[PDB]
Amino acid sequence: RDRFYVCPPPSGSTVVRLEPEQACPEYSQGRNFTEGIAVLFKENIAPHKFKAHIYYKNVIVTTVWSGSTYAAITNRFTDRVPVPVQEITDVIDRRGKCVSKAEYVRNNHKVTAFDRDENPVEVDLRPSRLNALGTRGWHTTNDTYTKIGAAGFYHTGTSVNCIVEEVEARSVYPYDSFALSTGDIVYMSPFYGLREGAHGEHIGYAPGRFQQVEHYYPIDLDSRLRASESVTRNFLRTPHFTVAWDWAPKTRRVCSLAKWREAEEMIRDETRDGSFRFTSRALGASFVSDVTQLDLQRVHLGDCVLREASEAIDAIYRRRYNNTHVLAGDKPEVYLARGGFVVAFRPLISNEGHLRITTGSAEFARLQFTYDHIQAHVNDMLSRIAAAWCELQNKDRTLWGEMSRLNPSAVATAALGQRVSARMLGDVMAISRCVEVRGGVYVQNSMRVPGERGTCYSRPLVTFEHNGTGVIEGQLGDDNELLISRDLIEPCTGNHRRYFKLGGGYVYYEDYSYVRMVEVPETISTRVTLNLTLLEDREFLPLEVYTREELADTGLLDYSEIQRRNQLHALK
Amino acid sequence: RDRFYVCPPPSGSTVVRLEPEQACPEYSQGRNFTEGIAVLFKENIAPHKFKAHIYYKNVIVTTVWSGSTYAAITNRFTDRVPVPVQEITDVIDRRGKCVSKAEYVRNNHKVTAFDRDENPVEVDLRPSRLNALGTRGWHTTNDTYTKIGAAGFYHTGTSVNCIVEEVEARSVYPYDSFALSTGDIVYMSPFYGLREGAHGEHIGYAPGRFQQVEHYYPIDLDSRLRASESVTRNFLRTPHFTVAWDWAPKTRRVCSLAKWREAEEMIRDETRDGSFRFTSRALGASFVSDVTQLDLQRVHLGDCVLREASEAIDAIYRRRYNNTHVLAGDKPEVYLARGGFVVAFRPLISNEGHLRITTGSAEFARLQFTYDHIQAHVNDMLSRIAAAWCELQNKDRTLWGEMSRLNPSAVATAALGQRVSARMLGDVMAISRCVEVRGGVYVQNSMRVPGERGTCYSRPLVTFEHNGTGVIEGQLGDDNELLISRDLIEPCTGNHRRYFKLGGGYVYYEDYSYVRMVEVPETISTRVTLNLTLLEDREFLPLEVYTREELADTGLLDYSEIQRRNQLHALK
Amino acid sequence: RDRFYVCPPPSGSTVVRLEPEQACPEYSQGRNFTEGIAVLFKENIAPHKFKAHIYYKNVIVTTVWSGSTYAAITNRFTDRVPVPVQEITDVIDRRGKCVSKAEYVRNNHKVTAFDRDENPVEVDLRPSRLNALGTRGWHTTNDTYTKIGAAGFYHTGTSVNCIVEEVEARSVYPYDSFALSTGDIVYMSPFYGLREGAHGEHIGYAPGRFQQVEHYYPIDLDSRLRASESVTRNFLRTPHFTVAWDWAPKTRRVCSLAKWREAEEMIRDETRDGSFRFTSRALGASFVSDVTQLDLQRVHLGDCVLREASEAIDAIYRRRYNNTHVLAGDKPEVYLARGGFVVAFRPLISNEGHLRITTGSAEFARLQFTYDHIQAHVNDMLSRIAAAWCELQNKDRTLWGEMSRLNPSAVATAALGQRVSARMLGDVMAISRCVEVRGGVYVQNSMRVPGERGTCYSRPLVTFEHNGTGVIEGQLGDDNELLISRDLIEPCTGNHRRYFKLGGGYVYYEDYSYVRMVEVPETISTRVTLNLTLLEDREFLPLEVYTREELADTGLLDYSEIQRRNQLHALK
């Protein structure tokens, strides 16, 4: 049951016009780009690894007690002993042998020891047995001298094993000490020398123990050779051994940074208060930096950057671009991106202080990229929709001005969302409200004009009442509008069926006479449908591949769990 | 070649009306928020670190054999020995000296030893040499006594070094034992005492070894001092040394949780079956919890939470809000978020059991946030589009009712997507189909009415055939509709050019006479364009900064790789 | 101030028509799916852990010097010694005792030792004390024999402790050696045997040391038992102990892969150059693989896959699907997904070479999923919008053809975006431009026709000038169009107010006479509004829960930091 309406004639009391076309939203100028090739450098967490050699003699003095039926070991004193630098160069290198005696200082006292307690003779250096992921080694003896029995007392045997070993060395920042595959820590920089500016490294020893030998040629101790190309060799004489390694300039062996990824399709994009954004589609990562370059000089040991960067970058240019684009500037540009990454970037042109800790994750970089990508897209495509909508609104207004001629009251009603009565005062609209009536309205069976044959009424005659208890003669208009003056008249026609609107239902008229009240179960739609649905809630539960527990348990031995045990020998 | 159509007069057989305006989709009420300040706590994986002191005497009994030309070490027996608590307090503390003799029990036998094998005299405690990231230490001697020669036999020397060392201590959960910078594991809780409820900690020793000293004043052993403010000192007497550290209540030194991040702009939002969602724009993370608070009491050692939370939160309130907002409640609220994070949250008001394992990642938290953010946006803006579309469909229907007067057949055709013939029965539409004809249709050169001068035909005369082999006289209507009755007549005019539609092409008429068949290569469009493009496939390849291999190799020494080696002395 | 326009009569010089309806964009066929159940397998980084037993005798030979007032330990030589296999089986197993003497070879010499230096008697194996997370153990003695004094010389004591220990064993890839809870590395495969194809494992020993005992029954050494079900027992005789463990086939104990996650709602989807995409809503991860299955045979030790996969999968089918769906094929399908994950997938049907390194992250998998999800949605819903827009443009054209009858010039102007003059030549449009005039245009006070009473002019009379200095008589049209011929005439009416458009403002006329120049501050809009807003910039700052620093510091002891210290005994 929808309302009935009487529409008083619109006087020029209120005058309105049709809202004119509006200015339609523009987009943005489209971001400025800079194509190019970039290399990403992380903080170098890796230790410095070099090869080295150990020379030590293996002093074991065992004392046995022989008796009636048995022999028993009362003692076994092992101790390692340093082979002198000359003994290395003049005997082990030159001849491949080693003196079977070790004259060393222990407890600030010059002492000695003899293999088999016999006389000092030079012995051949034989290889070891072998392996299970183990390096090279050499020794002089296969056994350790002990006591020849004859029941009675305690004889004390003395063996001496001359050992040369290939060992892998390891120094971590700041490299003022290193360590050997054998567990032994050397309290000095592997870059210490006597050269230009080496002397300025760290030594934890008396300078007599340290000694450098230039133009050394590293003899290989199996199948001999020297061979080509000489080395400056470092010798350190410790209380328990001697170590020899190849000295080289610090600045050339280690870097604080380390090449991580290359990016052939790298894109830089500046927006807002000075901020570059390096993004790689291949990687799937975005890197926000400043616009100011990194003064690479403010980095302790960062020379490998420009080196290895110029290298890779050029390698790719040869490999992908050299017939289409050209390098920009001479050197590549260098920026400190967020999260401790270093970006060396050289732009592509078509022929037409403190040190950095890299987060062990670049998760932000990819979350950036991903959001930055979608955001870009939906913003573009929604701006396109916003623009078309306005253009469509702009064009549709030509249809509405035309209709405000034939029917300015219907226009005005739609626009205002309420039933108004309107009509044109030339180029403008005069407007008034519409007042409700009750359901107490009655229709008449006759539509034929009494006073005249031939001319009938077009639309039904009604007697509607101001309230629900009166009478006024008028006729029916469109959309339940009750008119007053009864001058909607047409000539009579044969074959005359008519339907008219009344509240909710309709009314039928055959041959200008009332008949019945109809339904309208049949409809017709000019509507274009648009079923959008919502994006659903998702639940991101914690997903780790490896927990930290598992990550620690990977090792064969746990030094904490073993000391934890071996101590409890308040026991077994 | 599109079709021709004959449209039989629409009788009231089928009656339809124009589908009325529809109810337009509303949005959601807009989510309810709760601004505020939050602190995030992770599971504390860090060990408990305290300072401590070691007191031990260094017993080395060496035996030498002197001879003709040499001396040789036959043995060297080192062993560490505990300094008694009284010797600490009465000699080392009080005087700064140490007895050069060590009376200890070994093999369940009271034994002793003398430095230089001489008489017990009190010796000054001198500092050590120094450093390379090494703490403080003290000793009494710089050398170790050995044998004075005179060729002949085996003399046995005995040295004793009194050593006090500053050591860094480390206890991990559940702290029922700790360990020292020197490698030594103490099988007891660092919180064990004799106080109120300490006695209930773990000891792996006989109570005689343990001893507490209240109102101790920690003398500093270089440049002396006691000094201000006393300590309850713990003394443990081990077989190889004595350790002294500061006892303090367990509940006050360690927590199971640990402050991770603060969030000044934290937002909580409840939706669906009881679920809060803490999100920080700064962080870039979302944290789903329950609505029930965490009973912090069900956590073993979780007191640092409310402490350090109330601290930071307040610090920020002073720093950002105290003139605009106000704290809510008294205490902050506490929730267990997904992934083992603890959220202490105190809302902002404008003046107007078991323990937790924190995932070593919060990746879910940020993936949540990111999806939760976009989803929010596209859902809003697509609902806005959906709403406007319906409102636009609602308003456009006023244009379609108007047109169903001038031309109800064109309306009805568009709506139904097929060629229908329709016309108004008052307020309703009567509808019929349209039937095809063949291409075998012919046009006539004349458009002039024969029977009358002055009046011509408006639209061309055609003789169309029901099939492709007949004849019926009719004339041409719009859009290739073939009419029947030939009464589309107008007065004749000079300057008369006309084009009419025929299949695909058109037909020209000059001065009411046939001429030729034209093309129409010129078009005009009322269309608003909308070029949307699709979002492209992206490929997220695995991107790790550091592999686990590199992550293990960071250490200077690998206890597994060294034992792996030292054992192979089935060798060198 | 907008322009005035004169519109020359449109001749047939330019003829155009209204652009016809266009073909509307279709969607895609909707992707093809394959529901099912999947299990995810990662690379197994875990070591192989088995139980084992150690048998060794504890030889400590101490030598004391007794004197006047004291006794002093001059030496203490500990050494571990292997218990023979027969002694294990015939004494320790059978009887639960152990001979108080150890006949071992040391320095390639058969030697012996006696507890208390007395005669060999069999002694009972007692339990140890206990614990602090420590396993079982047994020994024979609680003390170590030393010297009975009587002042004078150096007596040498000899104790021997028989020890059996329960130890936890650990082998890592490739398991050609293992290690014990006690720190001891055994250089041999735990799967070595003498069986079919075991003999082919690694041994670093002489075969005499190795010995296998079939149908062994593992006696438990406290409260005895054998008991049920026999074992093939391995015995290795090392220089310092004996180890016994249970041999079993290698292929059955270890796998190179390891079950990680299960997925009940797993979805596979093929698109483009052969690529599956396994996605789980629960997990929140997507896994791109090839279409070719993984030949599981090309994997060293990958048998646990099909085992444990068929297990879980079936368990779930019973648990969720068995009344709705059915398994597909017999065996499950197996694919190598990106990032080193293995996917075993068995489809669901409604009743109707080299080895793999798994990245310690699956971050790509979830970033994939997340982007892949949104991309899917916005692409769908934007295609829906694109489709409706075209359908709406298609239907609206029926309104524009109707209007090109009543007003073809207004249509043509909107469409062309410029002021044109047009009119119908039957079924086609003739078109011309419109030429500007100046603001120098004048309106006349009179609207009454002089020559006739009764008939007035409808729209104002103007004298507009080609330039800004002429005269031509015409009248005013719509939208500031200046006409020429003055034949817009109507009968005169009482109650006559009129507004007309002039540049920007309007002009009022009462009773067919000029009055004033009005404003139009009242407007009316047929516009549907659409306020879209943009998605805002987000900043993803680096967010780590635990830095690698913290991750290393978790351990009680650092073997690198302790050796680092203990060495500096160039000191204290």
Contact call for B281 and C538, based on CB within 8 A: yes
Alpha-carbon gap: C213 to the closest alpha carbon of chain A (Å): 26
Residue-wise burial string across B7-36, b where 16 or more C-beta atoms lie within 10 A, e elsewhere: beebeeeebbbbeebeeeeeeeeeeeebeb
> Cβ–Cβ of B572/A165 closer than 8 Å?
yes
Q: Tokens for B227?
A: 């000094």
Cβ–Cβ of A137/B572 closer than 8 Å?
Answer: yes
Amino acid at A268: R
Residue A320 DSSP code: I
Task: Let me know: does B105 contact B134? Beta carbons within 8 Å.
Answer: no
Task: Look up residue B257 and give its two tokens.
Answer: 């949780």
Count each helix (H run) and each strand (E run) in chain A, helices first.
7, 35
Across the interface, do A428 and C499 touch by the CB < 8 Å criterion? yes
Helix or strand run (H / E) with residue B66 = strand B48-66
- Residue ranges covered by each domain of chain A: 1-9+435-522, 10-32+359-434, 33-46+253-358, 47-252, 523-572
What gap in Å lies between CA C330 and CA C311, rounded to an integer? 13
CB contact under 8 A, A426 and C133: no
> CB B379 to CB A534 under 8 A?
yes
Chains that touch B (3 or more CB pairs under 8 A): A, C
Distance from C-alpha of C234 to C-alpha of C191, rounded to nearest angstrom:
9
Please name the residue ranges forming H helices in B407-459.
408-416
CATH architecture of the domain A33-46+253-358 equals: Roll (2.30)
User: Measured between CA atoms, how close is B379 to chain A, in angstroms?
Assistant: 6
Residue in A371, A402, A561 nearest the CB of C407? A402
How far is Cα B320 from Cα A514, in angstroms, rounded to an integer?
79
Query: Do B46 and C415 make contact, defined as CB atoms within 8 angstroms?
Result: no
Q: What is the CA radius of gyration of chain A?
A: 50
B340 near B42, Cβ under 8 Å? yes
How far does the CA of residue C240 sit from the closest CA of chain A (Å)? Answer: 14
With H, G, I as helix, E, B as strand and everything else as coil, classify residue A445: coil
Query: Distances in Å between the alpha carbon of A93 and those of A330, C364, C475?
Result: 49, 55, 120
State the CATH architecture for C1-9+435-522.
Roll (2.30)
How far is the C-alpha of C17 from the C-alpha of C156, rounded, in Å?
124
C-chain CB neighbours of A12 within 8 Å are 497
- At position C336, the amino acid (one-letter code) is L
Distance, CA of A246 to CA of B69 (rounded, Å) = 38
Chain B residues in contact with A410 by the CB 8 A cut-off are 398, 401-402
Phi and psi angles of residue C431, each rounded to the nearest 5 degrees, phi first: -135, 140
Cα(A159)–Cα(A145) distance, integer angstroms: 5
CA distance C350 to C322: 10
Structure tokens at A132: 């299970």
List chain A residues with CB under 8 Å of B568.
132, 134
Beta bridge partners of C448: C456
Single-letter amino acid, residue B55? Y
- Closest approach of C361 to chain A, Cα-based (Å): 6
Q: In A294-362, where does DSSP find H-type helix?
A: 304-316
Contacts of C396 in chain A (CB under 8 A): 396
Name which of A144, A427, A544 to mutate to probe chain C: the one with the most chain C Cβ atoms within 10 A of its Cβ. Answer: A427
Method by which the model was determined: X-ray
Dihedrals phi, psi of A337, to nearest 5 degrees:
-80, 165
Residue (of B546, A361, B363, A545) closest to C43 by Cα position: A545
Structure tokens at C131: 């614990």
Nearest by CB: C382 against A17, A381, A531: A381
Helix, strand, or coil here: B406? Answer: helix
Query: Which chains are within 8 Å of A by 3+ CB pairs?
Result: B, C
User: What distance in Å separates residue C63's CA from the closest CA in chain A?
Assistant: 9
Instruction: Report resolution (Å) to 1 decimal.
Output: 3.1
Helix (H) or strand (E) holding C410: helix C408-416
Minimal CA separation from B53 to chain A, in Å:
20
C-alpha distances in angstroms, A36 versus A279, A321, A323, A348, A398? 11, 10, 15, 4, 50
The crossing angle, in degrees rounded to 10, of helices A363-406 and B363-406 is 10
DSSP for residue A6: E
Q: Say if the Cβ atoms of A499 and B15 lie within 8 Å.
A: yes
Q: What is the C-alpha separation between A140 and A97, in angstroms, rounded?
A: 8
**How many CB atoms are closer than 10 A to CB B555?**
17
Asked if residues B155 and B63 have their Cβ atoms less than 8 Å apart, the reply is: yes
> Residue B118 corresponds to which amino acid?
E
Q: A418 vs chain B: nearest CA distance in angstroms?
A: 12
Integer Cα distance of A382 and B378 in angstroms: 9
> Among residues B151, C57, C110, C114, which one has the least CA distance to residue A147?
C110
Q: Report the residue from C362, C391, C497 with minimal CB separation from A528.
A: C391
- Give the integer Cα–Cα distance in Å for C264 and C283: 10
- A10-32+359-434 in CATH: which number? 1.20.5.1890
Task: Please list every residue in chain A whose beta carbon sits closer than 8 Å to the beta carbon of residue C76.
Answer: none
The closest CB to that of A183, out of B551, B553, B557, belongs to B557
Give me the helices (H) in B166-216, please: none
Contact at CB, A410 and B401, closer than 8 angstroms: yes
Q: Are the C-beta atoms of residues B144 and A107 closer than 8 Å to each other? A: yes
Instruction: Decide if C520 and A566 are in contact by the 8 Å CB cutoff.
Output: no
**CB B179 to CB C368 under 8 A?**
no
The answer to whether the beta carbons of residues A41 and A257 sit under 8 Å apart is yes
Would the CB atoms of A548 and B45 count as touching at under 8 Å? yes
Contact between C71 and B111 using a beta-carbon 8 Å cutoff: yes
Residue in the structure block whose two tokens are 């003022």: A176
Vertex B282 angle, CA B278 and B286, to 5°: 25
Instruction: Using CA coordinates, name the residue in chain A closest to C534.
Output: A379
Cα–Cα distance measured from residue A332 to residue C456, given in angstroms and rounded to the nearest whole number: 84
Report chain A residues whose CB lies below 8 A from the CB of C413.
398
Distances (CA, A) of C494 to A405, A430, C456: 21, 17, 12
When CB atoms are compared, the residue of B46, B528, B535 closest to C375 is B535
Could you please state the CATH topology (level 3) that the domain comprising A523-572 is classified under.
Answer: 6.10.250
Cα torsion at A511, A516, A521, A522 (round to 10°)? 0
Gap between the Cα atoms of C340 and C358, Å rounded: 4
Judge whether B306 and B295 are in contact, CB under 8 Å. no
Cβ pair C77:A72 closer than 8 A: no
At CA C553, angle to CA A48 and CA B338, rounded to 5? 120
Q: Nearest CA of chain C to the CA of B526: how many Å?
A: 5
Per-residue tokens: A469: 């208890």
Q: How far apart are CA C50 and CA C178, in angstroms?
A: 10
**Nearest CB to B370; choose among A285, A367, A544:** A367
Whether residue C16 and residue B570 make contact (CB cut-off 8 A), yes or no, is: no
**Inter-chain touch B497–C370, beta carbons under 8 Å:** no
What chains are in contact with C, requiring at least 3 Cβ pairs below 8 Å?
A, B
Nearest CA in chain A to C156: A74
Nearest residue, CB atoms, C524 vs list A19, A370, A388: A19
Distance from CA of A32 to the nearest CA of C (A): 17
The chain C residue lying nearest A78, using CA atoms, is C77
Query: Are the CB atoms for C143 and B108 separated by under 8 Å?
Result: yes
CB C526 within 8 A of CB A411: yes
How do beta strands C4-6 and C185-186 pair? unpaired
Which of A370, A540, A546 to probe the B interface (max B CBs under 10 A)? Answer: A540
Would you state the structure tokens that stand for residue A291, as one six-digit string?
A: 């616009």
User: Helices H, strands E: what count in chain C?
Assistant: 7, 35
Cβ count near A285 (within 10 Å): 26
